[PDB]
Design a protein around this ligand. Sequence first.
Ligand code: FMN
Ligand code: CL
Ligand code: CL
Ligand code: CL
Ligand code: CL
Ligand code: CL
Ligand code: CL
Length: 308
Amino acid sequence: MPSLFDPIRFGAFTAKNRIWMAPLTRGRATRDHVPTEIMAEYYAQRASAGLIISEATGISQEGLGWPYAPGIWSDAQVEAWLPITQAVHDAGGLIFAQLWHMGRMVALRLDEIPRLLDDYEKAARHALKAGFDGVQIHAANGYLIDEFIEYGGAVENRIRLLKDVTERVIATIGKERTAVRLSPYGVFNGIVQVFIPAAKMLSDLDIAFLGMREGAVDGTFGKTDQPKLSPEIRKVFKPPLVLNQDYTFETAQAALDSGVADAISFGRPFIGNPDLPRRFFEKAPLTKDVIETWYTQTPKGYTDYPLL
Ligand SMILES: Cc1cc2nc3c(=O)[nH]c(=O)nc-3n(C[C@H](O)[C@H](O)[C@H](O)COP(=O)(O)O)c2cc1C
Ligand SMILES: [Cl-]
Ligand SMILES: [Cl-]
Ligand SMILES: [Cl-]
Ligand SMILES: [Cl-]
Ligand SMILES: [Cl-]
Ligand SMILES: [Cl-]
Protein backbone atom coordinates (compact mmCIF):
# COMPACT_ATOMS: atom_id res chain seq x y z
CA MET A 1 0.00 0.00 0.00
CA PRO A 2 2.41 2.86 1.02
CA SER A 3 4.52 4.96 -1.40
CA LEU A 4 8.27 5.44 -0.61
CA PHE A 5 7.38 9.09 -0.33
CA ASP A 6 4.70 8.63 2.36
CA PRO A 7 5.50 9.47 6.02
CA ILE A 8 5.90 6.69 8.53
CA ARG A 9 5.31 6.49 12.26
CA PHE A 10 7.95 4.66 14.23
CA GLY A 11 8.89 4.94 17.90
CA ALA A 12 8.12 8.44 19.07
CA PHE A 13 8.54 9.86 15.57
CA THR A 14 7.14 10.44 12.14
CA ALA A 15 9.71 10.15 9.35
CA LYS A 16 8.80 12.30 6.36
CA ASN A 17 9.35 9.44 3.90
CA ARG A 18 10.36 5.80 3.73
CA ILE A 19 13.70 6.41 1.92
CA TRP A 20 16.17 6.14 4.77
CA MET A 21 19.91 6.47 4.92
CA ALA A 22 21.78 3.36 5.98
CA PRO A 23 24.67 3.45 8.36
CA LEU A 24 28.00 4.38 6.62
CA THR A 25 31.44 4.48 8.17
CA ARG A 26 33.32 7.37 6.45
CA GLY A 27 36.41 8.09 8.56
CA ARG A 28 35.97 11.89 8.89
CA ALA A 29 36.19 11.96 12.70
CA THR A 30 39.58 12.76 14.45
CA ARG A 31 42.29 10.19 14.99
CA ASP A 32 41.10 9.90 18.56
CA HIS A 33 37.51 9.35 17.48
CA VAL A 34 36.04 12.82 18.09
CA PRO A 35 33.44 14.09 15.66
CA THR A 36 34.31 17.03 13.43
CA GLU A 37 32.54 20.05 11.98
CA ILE A 38 32.63 18.64 8.43
CA MET A 39 30.39 15.68 9.61
CA ALA A 40 27.64 18.24 10.44
CA GLU A 41 27.56 19.55 6.89
CA TYR A 42 27.57 15.99 5.51
CA TYR A 43 24.60 14.78 7.59
CA ALA A 44 22.65 17.99 7.01
CA GLN A 45 23.04 17.59 3.25
CA ARG A 46 21.31 14.19 3.61
CA ALA A 47 18.57 15.17 6.10
CA SER A 48 15.87 14.70 3.44
CA ALA A 49 16.21 10.99 4.30
CA GLY A 50 13.26 9.97 6.42
CA LEU A 51 15.70 8.79 8.99
CA ILE A 52 19.47 8.92 8.96
CA ILE A 53 21.17 5.98 10.70
CA SER A 54 24.66 7.21 11.63
CA GLU A 55 27.98 5.66 10.87
CA ALA A 56 29.10 3.05 13.36
CA THR A 57 29.95 4.81 16.60
CA GLY A 58 32.14 3.20 19.20
CA ILE A 59 30.94 2.59 22.79
CA SER A 60 34.26 1.84 24.55
CA GLN A 61 37.61 3.59 24.61
CA GLU A 62 39.95 0.74 23.57
CA GLY A 63 37.65 -1.57 21.61
CA LEU A 64 37.01 0.51 18.42
CA GLY A 65 39.84 1.34 17.40
CA TRP A 66 39.26 2.29 13.67
CA PRO A 67 40.77 5.67 13.72
CA TYR A 68 38.92 8.39 12.17
CA ALA A 69 35.65 6.62 13.21
CA PRO A 70 33.75 8.32 16.04
CA GLY A 71 32.84 7.16 19.47
CA ILE A 72 30.34 8.32 22.08
CA TRP A 73 31.86 7.18 25.44
CA SER A 74 33.22 10.60 26.38
CA ASP A 75 31.83 14.02 27.20
CA ALA A 76 34.10 15.59 24.59
CA GLN A 77 32.48 13.28 22.00
CA VAL A 78 28.94 14.23 23.22
CA GLU A 79 29.86 17.87 22.80
CA ALA A 80 31.32 17.31 19.33
CA TRP A 81 28.19 15.42 18.14
CA LEU A 82 25.87 18.31 19.05
CA PRO A 83 26.56 20.29 15.91
CA ILE A 84 25.74 17.29 13.73
CA THR A 85 22.39 16.51 15.35
CA GLN A 86 21.55 20.16 15.46
CA ALA A 87 22.23 20.51 11.71
CA VAL A 88 20.05 17.53 10.91
CA HIS A 89 17.22 18.90 13.02
CA ASP A 90 17.59 22.41 11.54
CA ALA A 91 17.08 20.72 8.19
CA GLY A 92 13.95 19.05 9.52
CA GLY A 93 15.32 15.48 9.61
CA LEU A 94 15.93 12.68 12.11
CA ILE A 95 19.09 10.86 13.14
CA PHE A 96 19.81 7.67 15.14
CA ALA A 97 23.32 6.78 16.32
CA GLN A 98 24.45 3.28 15.35
CA LEU A 99 26.28 1.93 18.37
CA TRP A 100 29.14 -0.46 17.58
CA HIS A 101 30.80 -3.11 19.59
CA MET A 102 33.29 -5.39 17.74
CA GLY A 103 32.55 -9.11 18.43
CA ARG A 104 34.41 -12.39 17.59
CA MET A 105 32.83 -15.57 16.11
CA VAL A 106 33.12 -19.08 17.66
CA ALA A 107 37.33 -11.64 22.27
CA LEU A 108 35.03 -11.18 25.28
CA ARG A 109 35.02 -12.79 28.75
CA LEU A 110 31.92 -13.66 30.79
CA ASP A 111 33.28 -11.31 33.46
CA GLU A 112 33.31 -8.36 31.01
CA ILE A 113 29.55 -8.64 30.08
CA PRO A 114 28.55 -6.23 32.87
CA ARG A 115 31.04 -3.64 31.71
CA LEU A 116 29.70 -4.13 28.17
CA LEU A 117 26.11 -3.53 29.27
CA ASP A 118 27.26 -0.49 31.19
CA ASP A 119 29.07 0.83 28.09
CA TYR A 120 25.95 0.55 26.01
CA GLU A 121 23.85 2.25 28.73
CA LYS A 122 26.24 5.05 28.87
CA ALA A 123 26.55 5.41 25.06
CA ALA A 124 22.76 5.43 24.75
CA ARG A 125 22.41 8.13 27.42
CA HIS A 126 25.26 10.12 25.84
CA ALA A 127 23.48 9.86 22.48
CA LEU A 128 20.40 11.57 23.98
CA LYS A 129 22.68 14.23 25.49
CA ALA A 130 24.24 14.68 22.06
CA GLY A 131 20.84 15.37 20.61
CA PHE A 132 20.36 12.10 18.65
CA ASP A 133 16.73 10.96 18.31
CA GLY A 134 17.67 7.40 19.23
CA VAL A 135 20.12 4.59 18.76
CA GLN A 136 20.52 1.43 16.66
CA ILE A 137 22.23 -1.64 18.03
CA HIS A 138 24.02 -3.73 15.42
CA ALA A 139 23.89 -7.54 15.67
CA ALA A 140 25.18 -10.26 13.37
CA ASN A 141 26.74 -13.69 13.70
CA GLY A 142 29.94 -12.42 15.26
CA TYR A 143 28.18 -9.60 17.21
CA LEU A 144 25.85 -10.07 20.22
CA ILE A 145 24.49 -13.14 18.53
CA ASP A 146 26.73 -16.25 18.91
CA GLU A 147 29.41 -14.08 20.20
CA PHE A 148 32.56 -15.85 21.45
CA ILE A 149 32.48 -15.76 25.29
CA GLU A 150 25.05 -19.74 29.07
CA TYR A 151 25.50 -17.88 25.76
CA GLY A 152 25.23 -21.15 23.77
CA GLY A 153 23.05 -24.07 22.85
CA ALA A 154 19.36 -23.27 23.06
CA VAL A 155 18.35 -20.37 20.72
CA GLU A 156 17.44 -18.41 23.90
CA ASN A 157 21.07 -18.47 25.01
CA ARG A 158 22.48 -17.79 21.53
CA ILE A 159 20.49 -14.46 21.37
CA ARG A 160 20.79 -13.70 25.13
CA LEU A 161 23.51 -11.08 24.94
CA LEU A 162 21.47 -9.20 22.27
CA LYS A 163 18.37 -9.34 24.47
CA ASP A 164 20.26 -8.13 27.51
CA VAL A 165 21.88 -5.29 25.54
CA THR A 166 18.56 -4.23 24.01
CA GLU A 167 16.78 -4.31 27.43
CA ARG A 168 19.47 -2.18 29.02
CA VAL A 169 19.22 0.40 26.21
CA ILE A 170 15.45 0.43 26.44
CA ALA A 171 15.66 0.93 30.27
CA THR A 172 17.87 3.90 29.58
CA ILE A 173 16.19 5.74 26.68
CA GLY A 174 12.87 3.98 26.02
CA LYS A 175 11.82 1.43 23.47
CA GLU A 176 10.54 4.25 21.22
CA ARG A 177 14.16 5.38 20.73
CA THR A 178 15.74 1.94 20.41
CA ALA A 179 16.26 0.16 17.09
CA VAL A 180 18.31 -2.82 15.86
CA ARG A 181 20.00 -3.85 12.59
CA LEU A 182 20.38 -7.59 11.88
CA SER A 183 23.01 -8.54 9.26
CA PRO A 184 22.39 -12.33 8.77
CA TYR A 185 24.73 -12.53 5.74
CA GLY A 186 27.66 -10.82 7.44
CA VAL A 187 28.88 -7.41 8.48
CA PHE A 188 31.52 -6.06 6.08
CA ASN A 189 30.97 -8.19 2.98
CA GLY A 190 22.09 -21.71 10.83
CA ILE A 191 20.67 -18.27 9.85
CA VAL A 192 16.97 -19.22 9.93
CA GLN A 193 17.41 -21.16 13.14
CA VAL A 194 18.64 -18.03 14.96
CA PHE A 195 17.69 -14.73 13.21
CA ILE A 196 13.94 -15.53 13.14
CA PRO A 197 13.90 -16.06 16.94
CA ALA A 198 16.13 -12.94 17.36
CA ALA A 199 13.51 -10.96 15.51
CA LYS A 200 10.56 -12.44 17.51
CA MET A 201 12.41 -11.57 20.72
CA LEU A 202 12.95 -7.98 19.51
CA SER A 203 9.33 -7.73 18.48
CA ASP A 204 8.28 -8.74 21.97
CA LEU A 205 10.53 -5.98 23.33
CA ASP A 206 8.53 -3.68 20.99
CA ILE A 207 11.61 -1.77 19.65
CA ALA A 208 11.01 1.13 17.36
CA PHE A 209 12.06 -0.56 14.09
CA LEU A 210 14.18 -3.39 12.83
CA GLY A 211 16.68 -2.95 10.01
CA MET A 212 17.56 -6.10 8.07
CA ARG A 213 20.31 -6.40 5.53
CA GLU A 214 19.29 -8.91 2.87
CA GLY A 215 19.93 -8.83 -0.86
CA ALA A 216 16.99 -7.36 -2.77
CA VAL A 217 17.84 -9.80 -5.73
CA ASP A 218 16.12 -13.15 -6.45
CA GLY A 219 18.13 -15.10 -9.08
CA THR A 220 21.96 -14.91 -9.16
CA PHE A 221 24.03 -16.87 -11.71
CA GLY A 222 26.06 -19.76 -10.21
CA LYS A 223 24.11 -19.53 -6.91
CA THR A 224 21.72 -22.26 -5.91
CA ASP A 225 18.32 -21.11 -4.66
CA GLN A 226 17.63 -20.43 -0.97
CA PRO A 227 14.42 -18.75 0.24
CA LYS A 228 14.60 -15.13 1.47
CA LEU A 229 14.74 -14.55 5.24
CA SER A 230 12.69 -11.36 5.07
CA PRO A 231 9.22 -12.76 4.60
CA GLU A 232 9.81 -14.98 7.59
CA ILE A 233 11.09 -12.00 9.64
CA ARG A 234 7.97 -10.08 8.65
CA LYS A 235 5.77 -12.77 10.17
CA VAL A 236 7.35 -12.70 13.63
CA PHE A 237 8.25 -8.95 13.76
CA LYS A 238 5.34 -6.60 14.34
CA PRO A 239 6.91 -3.07 14.47
CA PRO A 240 8.26 -1.41 11.33
CA LEU A 241 10.59 -3.47 9.16
CA VAL A 242 13.20 -1.68 7.09
CA LEU A 243 15.03 -3.67 4.44
CA ASN A 244 18.48 -2.92 3.01
CA GLN A 245 21.01 -4.07 0.33
CA ASP A 246 21.09 -3.27 -3.41
CA TYR A 247 17.66 -1.64 -3.53
CA THR A 248 16.75 0.58 -6.42
CA PHE A 249 13.78 2.87 -6.54
CA GLU A 250 11.84 0.17 -8.35
CA THR A 251 12.71 -2.81 -6.20
CA ALA A 252 12.28 -0.62 -3.06
CA GLN A 253 8.73 0.38 -4.07
CA ALA A 254 8.04 -3.27 -4.97
CA ALA A 255 9.03 -4.32 -1.48
CA LEU A 256 6.62 -1.71 0.02
CA ASP A 257 3.93 -2.91 -2.46
CA SER A 258 4.35 -6.55 -1.37
CA GLY A 259 3.83 -5.72 2.31
CA VAL A 260 7.19 -7.21 3.39
CA ALA A 261 8.86 -3.81 4.12
CA ASP A 262 7.53 -0.60 5.60
CA ALA A 263 10.61 1.40 4.56
CA ILE A 264 13.94 0.80 2.78
CA SER A 265 17.44 2.11 3.67
CA PHE A 266 20.01 2.99 1.03
CA GLY A 267 23.70 3.12 1.74
CA ARG A 268 25.97 3.71 -1.25
CA PRO A 269 23.40 5.82 -3.16
CA PHE A 270 23.44 8.43 -0.30
CA ILE A 271 27.23 8.78 -0.59
CA GLY A 272 26.95 10.47 -4.03
CA ASN A 273 23.32 11.52 -3.91
CA PRO A 274 22.64 13.60 -0.85
CA ASP A 275 19.12 14.39 -2.16
CA LEU A 276 18.32 10.85 -3.04
CA PRO A 277 14.61 11.20 -2.25
CA ARG A 278 14.20 14.05 -4.70
CA ARG A 279 16.15 12.23 -7.43
CA PHE A 280 13.86 9.27 -6.96
CA PHE A 281 10.80 11.53 -7.11
CA GLU A 282 11.99 13.34 -10.25
CA LYS A 283 13.46 10.17 -11.79
CA ALA A 284 16.76 12.03 -12.06
CA PRO A 285 20.01 10.28 -12.86
CA LEU A 286 22.24 9.34 -9.93
CA THR A 287 25.75 10.60 -9.36
CA LYS A 288 28.26 7.75 -9.25
CA ASP A 289 30.12 7.47 -5.91
CA VAL A 290 33.82 7.38 -5.86
CA ILE A 291 34.90 4.31 -3.94
CA GLU A 292 38.42 5.67 -3.43
CA THR A 293 37.16 8.39 -1.10
CA TRP A 294 34.70 6.31 1.01
CA TYR A 295 37.19 6.24 3.91
CA THR A 296 39.60 9.08 3.34
CA GLN A 297 39.81 11.92 5.84
CA THR A 298 38.87 15.07 3.81
CA PRO A 299 35.79 16.76 2.35
CA LYS A 300 36.57 15.36 -1.11
CA GLY A 301 34.23 12.49 -1.94
CA TYR A 302 32.30 13.51 1.32
CA THR A 303 30.54 16.92 1.22
CA ASP A 304 31.32 17.86 -2.44
CA TYR A 305 28.72 15.83 -4.17
CA PRO A 306 26.20 18.35 -5.51
CA LEU A 307 22.44 18.47 -4.87
CA LEU A 308 20.25 18.58 -7.99
C1 FMN B 1 31.37 2.92 2.88
C2 FMN B 1 30.43 2.02 3.60
C3 FMN B 1 30.36 2.11 4.98
C4 FMN B 1 29.47 1.28 5.67
N1 FMN B 1 29.42 1.37 7.05
C5 FMN B 1 28.56 0.65 7.83
C6 FMN B 1 28.44 0.90 9.21
O1 FMN B 1 29.12 1.81 9.80
N2 FMN B 1 27.53 0.14 9.86
C7 FMN B 1 26.83 -0.87 9.24
O2 FMN B 1 26.06 -1.55 9.91
N3 FMN B 1 26.94 -1.09 7.88
C8 FMN B 1 27.73 -0.31 7.17
N4 FMN B 1 27.83 -0.45 5.79
C9 FMN B 1 26.86 -1.33 5.14
C10 FMN B 1 25.70 -0.45 4.58
O3 FMN B 1 24.91 0.17 5.61
C11 FMN B 1 24.71 -1.16 3.66
O4 FMN B 1 24.14 -2.16 4.50
C12 FMN B 1 25.38 -1.66 2.32
O5 FMN B 1 26.20 -0.68 1.76
C13 FMN B 1 24.26 -2.20 1.44
O6 FMN B 1 23.22 -1.29 1.16
P1 FMN B 1 23.34 -0.44 -0.21
O7 FMN B 1 23.33 -1.47 -1.34
O8 FMN B 1 22.04 0.35 -0.23
O9 FMN B 1 24.66 0.34 -0.23
C14 FMN B 1 28.69 0.35 5.03
C15 FMN B 1 28.77 0.26 3.61
C16 FMN B 1 29.67 1.05 2.94
C17 FMN B 1 29.71 0.92 1.45
CL1 CL C 1 2.63 5.31 9.66
CL1 CL D 1 36.54 19.95 13.60
CL1 CL E 1 33.79 0.50 20.96
CL1 CL F 1 34.32 11.88 29.68
CL1 CL G 1 9.85 4.94 24.89
CL1 CL H 1 26.21 3.16 -5.54
